[model samples]
Target: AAAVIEEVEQRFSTPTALLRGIADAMVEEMERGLRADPHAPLKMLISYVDNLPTGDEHGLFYALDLGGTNFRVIRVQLGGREKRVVSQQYEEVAIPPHLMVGTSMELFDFIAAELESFVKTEGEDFHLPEGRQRELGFTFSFPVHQTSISSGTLIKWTKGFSINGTVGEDVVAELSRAMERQGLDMKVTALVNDTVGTLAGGRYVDNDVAAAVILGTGTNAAYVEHANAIPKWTGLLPRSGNMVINMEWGNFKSERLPRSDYDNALDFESLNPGEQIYEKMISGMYLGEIVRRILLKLAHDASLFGDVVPTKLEQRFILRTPDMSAMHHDTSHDLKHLGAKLKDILGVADTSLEARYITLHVCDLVAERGARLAAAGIYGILKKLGRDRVPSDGSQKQRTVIALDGGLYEHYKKFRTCLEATLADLLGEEAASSVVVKLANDGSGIGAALLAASH
Candidate 1:
């Protein structure tokens, strides 16, 4: 039994050397994506946000975050650098389940109705300037092909959104038509992915923020790149000589990745087969599922839970990441948390001390691999931007802060610590000193508002 467990853990381990190799492959994919290689997995989608927030934005601006089951409408009054965000407010509304698979027109109109009502609730202190039509930023957390900062056509929907007539249609135009129908006078000046919005939000406070990553149920990354480096870009270069590239990094594939039979089974059963392989390995949505599969294997092969496996053990995602975190971090004298979580979640009650220890170790294995791989992904971005190392010449080492948002990055202490530590380890002692990861709490909503104000 011990030998089997040891072998399973070895299959999940990602040593520093392996992580570095994966990062190198990521760098190669990023270059391929920039060249518009038809076969490249990393879609270097252009986000037309040549100008990031300058902290000079003024007046009232609105933002809408349409990511999943719920969408948030946000409004903020910016008083420029002196006062920064003077005031802000938002309302979250759930999308009817039917709307996800419904027609595009219905979804837009439903969103427009909510935005109109939310707009009317603005306080007296947050008044818009007279004669200026209301302007908004749309934080559409889906893949898009942006022609400008304010307009983009939808590519496809994730997060359970599958509206017909939406793909290949200009999302901004669809919203504009909906607003017109609802008698709302507003304009969407910036259409951004959540990661781009987070970067804008992080940059508003500190100029050193050059990249952003979302590590929630699904994971993605975006970073500022040199305009001249993008061989696929045919547009006129902006004055800033910088462009934000939305690296659809979830789809990143590398031969060095430590994949097991469990991951293969998960991929085969997933909604998106053979896609988002990296995300499935490291994201919140799959971490717990991976552990469930491990426990199932133990019950069936090793009989860790007696002759009969708990019925719930066969269920996918019954053991959530938070539940797993509690078990992993449960180091009490009796290991009560792990015991209770097993009984409560998996219906395996009164686990032996050895059972608890093994369960805890399994959680550690899953989280450690996910965190290390996540760090490797970040290192890949750093290597691309030349931020993984200190200045080659005798010069000041510039600080590069990457804004990160996601429940997995935020609430999971062990996962967060492992990720930060692993990234530092990859960068080494000298270069790691110049890097910082800031938690941008719900930056997507407020950041979109800031972009609306700036653009």
Candidate 2:
């Protein structure tokens, strides 16, 4: 049993030297993606958001966000730089199962109808100026070949949506046509990813926020970049000379990544084999599953659970990240909490303290590796933006704030702590002193409204 866990430590432990090398490798891949290298792992797609929120935005703006099974409609009355978000109201509508796999029109029309009704609920807090059409920030969270701020063609569908004729079609047009059908008069002024929206939300309140990261079921990051620095950019420069790049860092791949047999097996058995390599190790979607695999191994080799592996423990994804986080966080004097969790999740009872310790140990190994690599990914983005260290100018000590959102970061305290500490380590004391990580509280939708206002 000792040797079995020791093997995990050897394979999964990421020393500073390894993390530093991974950071550099990330930078190299990012540049390659920016240059439009065909084989680069990172997509580094252009977000076409030339104008981020500048806090001077005012007036009422609507936002429509369609990412998961449910869609959200939000309206915000911006009070500009002083009053900020004066008032806001949002409504969530769950989509029917048939719509997800139905025609594109059906999905959009359903969503548009919801938006139309939600518009009727507008009240005293919301205000629309005379003769101004309702502007909307469309936050479509999926893969797309972004053509303009307000238009993009869907590349492919994930998260189990299989709407026909939507691929290679502009999502904005789909929503626009549906809105027309629903008699909802609104224009999508800006279309952004959730990460972009979070950044926009952060930027509205703080001037220093330069990037956004999401650490939920899956993970991704986006950051502001100079237009002139993109070697493969073939478009005319914008007035602000700044653009946002969606660093699809989930697909980031490198040999520097420390993967064990468990990770390899997980990837091999996934729906998209050998894809989203980085996300497989770091994101919430896979963290619990990885822990499951590790524990299963221990159970098989050393009877950690019993002489026979627990049936539930052998099941894939049966152990959830929230539960594992609960176990890892258990601080009972005799690990009673951990034992109870094992019984509840794995169908094992009367687990010895030693067995409980091993289970928690496995969680630690998985969480530590995930957090460290996540930090390396953030470090890579900061390095690319020249925000990893103090600026060259000696007169200024600028702060770089990152808007972090998602259930994983919010619920998993240990993971969040490790990620923050690892990031500080990578940035060093001098540079780390000025960095800040702020929670993007429900900003995904609000940011869209703000983006529409700015655009």
Candidate 3:
């Protein structure tokens, strides 16, 4: 007699097994990227301010952040170790859609005009006390090749930008031209990526800061590296004696990716098919949508919910991760808050109390998968750095700290808990505690300031 093989398994089915397999593939791609690139070795760039140079050293500095839809301007009066950030002023201005996708000159010129107007507000007393030149740090969120702190050329646009004729041009020159047009006397001192800014900012406060990671609308990271390590660049190093590497980790993918009907549909319909593999799995942009796709399937096939599935719930990503977070955090036995949030956000007013309970379970499932996947990526980084496992040779017991920022990790309690727990599961209790995941807020702004101070 031959052994009998069951048609279906209880826990791991074809779909579920495929999911874990793809997750594993994603982790492998991350590890490979860390090895091939110097920008974020070991795939570790957790944007956190390790140290910040107090303005007490005496000078004037400005930081301009062109992130997302707005540009942020920050002015700091530094006296160094003594007086330290004597005064500061900050403001955010929305960038018009036309300008964002317009010619390079038009966009840079508008920015220059705003900067000039902002400087006029600084009273005469706030001016630098001596021959010190006014310094500016430009944080350009887009991709560019940095020749020096003050200069860089645009490589290519990302984040839905398709401005023609701007590609391959010197971005610093364009901005400098704008400044000249406005008669602004400030000298451009630093040109940094948002991830780099965050890393520098985190390091300013804590020397232990090793990596900076951002988990916002999109995802990326940057970290400090030795000049000698960059075999690709042939030039004099920055005055800081360290170079910041920007790891475009969002584009990571693998051949072994697990594909579900939902994931496949999402990929086929997305702006860029078969791309941003790591981002799709980990970023805020795709998590809820993934859950929505899966739920729709369950409703149709297994009739998990009521006879008539709510039409509104069938909509793609109708339930945002933030809303899911609210549901998961519901501690009341009645889950009244969860029901209310679901009704308000999803426009599903007819959901009964039982339906609300079922919705919470869905939220838990989606959140747990996301958290576990993130932990796997983190583990990949540790393994690459030989930090995942402790060495017998004791040299102060090598500690790796990951600087985490963004709404997803910070606000989602269920997601964060799942991530932490999965990390423990992957590393075991003792090893997991050795690696610290710390929250470093406002890394982009602070990092730009640190780079400005260094310049």
Candidate 4:
């Protein structure tokens, strides 16, 4: 049993050399993507955000976050540079499973109706000046081809979402048409990706913030880049000299990325095979699944969990990330939490202490690799921006802040810690001291509002 476990650990281990190699590969991919190289794995999509928030715009703006299972509607009253967000209110609505698979009109209509209802309940504290039409920042967390800040066509659906007539259509137009049908007077001033929104949200609070990363059910990143850095963009440059580039980095694939038999099997069976390879290894949606596959192998091959394999253990995604986290953090002398989780989640009851220890080690190996790789990816972004090194002139150090959001980074304590530590290791202690990975709470929602005001 010990030999089998050791073999598995060796297969998944990520050493310092591996981390550096992955980071170098990621940097190379980013360069190719920026040049619009067809073979590049990173998309490096140009976000139409020519200008970031200056913290001087004042207005009441609405933000709609439509991604995954739930959509959120937020109304924020910005008091400009002085007050920032004076007042705000928001409501979350869950989409019906049937509606997710239904026609595009059905989904848009449902969203519009919810927006109208939320707008109707606006109190006097949330004031909209007369003669000013309501504006909105739409944070659509999906793939889209943007023609401008206010319009984009959906490229495809992800996160188990598929609405007919929505693909290749203007999502902004669809939502606007639905609003017209309901007689709701509003305009989508800005259509932003969740990662872009996160960047904007971070910049609003801190001028030093230059990047935003989402470590949720899925993973993505957006960063502020010089307008002249993008070779594929032929459009007129903005006055601010900066643009946000949405790095659809989940799809990033490279020969250097460490992949095992378990990952290959998961990819083979996934809905979008041969895609989002990086996301499959690091995101919340797949970590628990990886752990499950490993445990299944151990149970079947090594007889770690008794004579018969638990039937539930064969199921995919039965063990969630939260469950893995709980088990990983179990501090009891007997690993009571780990035992309970195994019994309840996988129907593998009464695990011996040795078995529990092995399970915990498996979880650690999976999560540590994910966290370290994520750190390497961040290092890649920093290297691209030339922030990884000290200035030649030896001027005072400037801070580079990365705003990170999503449930995985927010809730997974061990993973977050590991990622930060690995990043510090990659960058020396002096350079690391100047870098900050701050959590921008509700960055997507608030960022949309900020973009709406800026646009």
Candidate 5:
């Protein structure tokens, strides 16, 4: 008898639909919020940003990016008057684990200490006039309640962290305490979420940028809104006449995504099993892990890899999305490079050609699912803003531009294409054409600085 081939195609189930439905409801709720108050304008979820000043806007500014395992410090010399991003320098330092899970003061203090060192090492390349209090833009990745571009309160911890004394407190105040402790003369002039920063950074060069989305370690979107649109916020107006809204898209869930046994297992085993419902379906952090769980099941349950699964490949999430992306992009005959890369990464040497073929198939399966699901989320955003019906070629419509960033979107070509394709499928070619997806590199860091300058 011939071997029975079992093919798994990604399709959304009851769970996925329910999640997407919830997302749609949330969007509707926000829109309703906008409708109830004419004073409360409906700003897009992705924030609009302006470009940084060149040498013309003479001033010393600093940016601190807290994301992933590293904190990055960036110094810029803005020549104001619109020359645009005259020059900038950045350095990334890894945080000690103790600090990540320790007291909030410890984490901020460590960050301040690093900032002081960076300022000390500033050479002639970094110019600061005497008696000038430097301006700083702080990019804090965790969820925060914004009072304005210059201030926000920490809501809670995410990205695998739980620190005390920070939640529900002013993050800027925390940093200020640390800065005072370190005796640093710099003042934090702006506090912008990472997604908002990316939008500002993207817009500094391009006037067309209206929205920005981050799809790396986590997923989030930011967009600009007119001051009149935010009814919930009755605070002072920002100088740019706009406010950035951080759409916690990761909290979005939908039954529209196709799920497999692997997704379920991973979800059940995740720290917040039923939480971040949308992030689990898409995003780089969980994609490879989902694939791993599936492949492991296939090997153990069906003996697909000849009697025993490759021990090296059985590890949880050992395979990253980038690696999977590389394999999918490989076009060589017999996929020699895919096999070689996999072997090199997973310590699975001596694997047969047949096994390599199966691995490639697994990569394709997961990548396709992720791309389509990501498209759905983007579509949901467009629909909420009433911009999904415009023509693609700037004709007869309100223009909608989506600014995308992060390592996964930048490095993964196939994933990008699939996502674009799915968007086209959902919105139709003409409407999709109107929706422009622009990749804005490091928009968050740039956005923070721009907001500071504007304010």
Candidate 6:
């Protein structure tokens, strides 16, 4: 048992030096991504949002948040200036499993129908002024090549959405056509990524916000960048002198990133293999699978769970992050909850205390690495933005806020705490004190509405 434990520890070992090295490598990669001859791993796509919310805009606006298997339609009434958002409401609609793989028209038509239904139900609290057509801010959380604030061409689909005839097409135009067919009078004024929307939403409340990150089933980041910094952009820079850059940071991969045989095996079997390598390691979607693989190995070699491996244990993704979180947070003296979870989720019954302890250890190893690495990634972003260092002029230190959203950061207590602690460790107490990680709930939806009002 000691030998097996040692072997697993060695494979998953992440020392302080390694974490610093990873942070430095990420800083370099971010710089490389901003260069004219950018590297392949990080796209650092230009978001085309030259201006963020200023808190002075007012109007009735709508936002559609389409990501994953579910989509949300939101309606917000902005009071403008001091009032900010007056009232807001939203409805969530789940896409049929078949529609996810169907034609682009089919998928979008379904979305348009839902939007039409929601629009019809708008009450007196929501108001559209005379001579003003209804406007929308479309939050399309996917890879897009933005030609303008309101339009973009789809690069590809992620998160298990693969509709035919969508790639290389203008997503806004598709939605527009669908709305037209439904006789809905609405214009898409902005097409933004969820991270971009998050930043905008964060900025709407506090102008100090500098970046936004999502840490859900997948991970991505967007930050405010100087317009001149993007060497790949040949168009005339916006008057604001700043633009949001969606750093598709999930695909970021380098040799410095810690990876084990389990990570490699999981990546090899993923739907989009060889892609989103960083996301596979740090996101909620794969963390439980990593723990499962380690347990499987221990069960096979160390007889950790008795002679026979449970059939349910061998199943892919049988163990989810929530289940892992439940086990990790069990506080009973006898680990009663942990044992119940193992039996209920993995069909492993009557496990000894030693086995339960080992299982908890494995969960800690996987989640801690992910949390620490996620912090490293955030530090890298701060380093790129010059927020990691004190000013030479000894000017008043400004507050730098990172607007964070997603289920993992919201629900996983240990992961969130470890990430913040690791970030403080990397940045030191003084510098870290000036940086705040704020949770912006539903920023993607409200942020889009804010953007629409601003535009």
Give candidate 5's TM-score. 0.83
Task: Give a tens-digit lDDT track for model 5, residues 29-113.
Answer: 4564444434222222323332332223455578888875788988866656565566778889999988889898999999999
- TM-score on alpha carbons, each prediction: 0.95, 0.96, 0.81, 0.94, 0.83, 0.94
Candidate 6 lDDT tens digits, 1-455: 44576666866676768888888888777777777443467878788887888787777788898977899999887887778788788899999999989999999999998998998887654655554778888888777889988899999987788778778989999999999988789889899888889888888887788998888888999898877667666434434388788888999887978888899999889988898999999999999999998888877766787788787888899999888899998887778889898899878779878888888888888889888888888998888888987676553256799989888899999999988998888887778888899997776686555555455
- In model 2, the runs with Cα more than 4 Å from the true position are 129-131, 234-240, 391-396
Reference-based lDDT, each prediction: 0.86, 0.86, 0.64, 0.86, 0.69, 0.84
Arrange candidates by TM-score, highest first: which order? 2, 1, 4, 6, 5, 3
Model 2 per-residue lDDT tens digits across residues 223-248: 89888767677534434388889888
lDDT assessment of candidate 6: 0.84
> Model 3: per-residue lDDT, tens digit, 1-455?
21111111211122434444554554455444434554332343222222344333455678788777788888876655666557777788888889878877788788888988897787532654655667777788876766665677788877756666556777767777789999787777677777677766655545555666777666776654444434344223423344555666677665543335566688888888876766776777787787666656655654444575656877766877666677778888878888777667655565666666666676666566556666666665555445666666662264667777878888887777777777666765667777777777776565446755565
Between which residue pairs do clashes occur in model 2? Answer: none
| Model 3, CA-based lDDT | 0.64
Off by over 4 Å in 6: 157-164, 234-240, 393-396
lDDT of 5 at 450: 67
Stretches of candidate 4 above 4 Å error? 157-162, 234-240, 393-396
TM-score of 6: 0.94
Give the per-residue Cα lDDT of candidate 1 at 99.
Answer: 87
Error of 2 at 292 (Å): 0.6
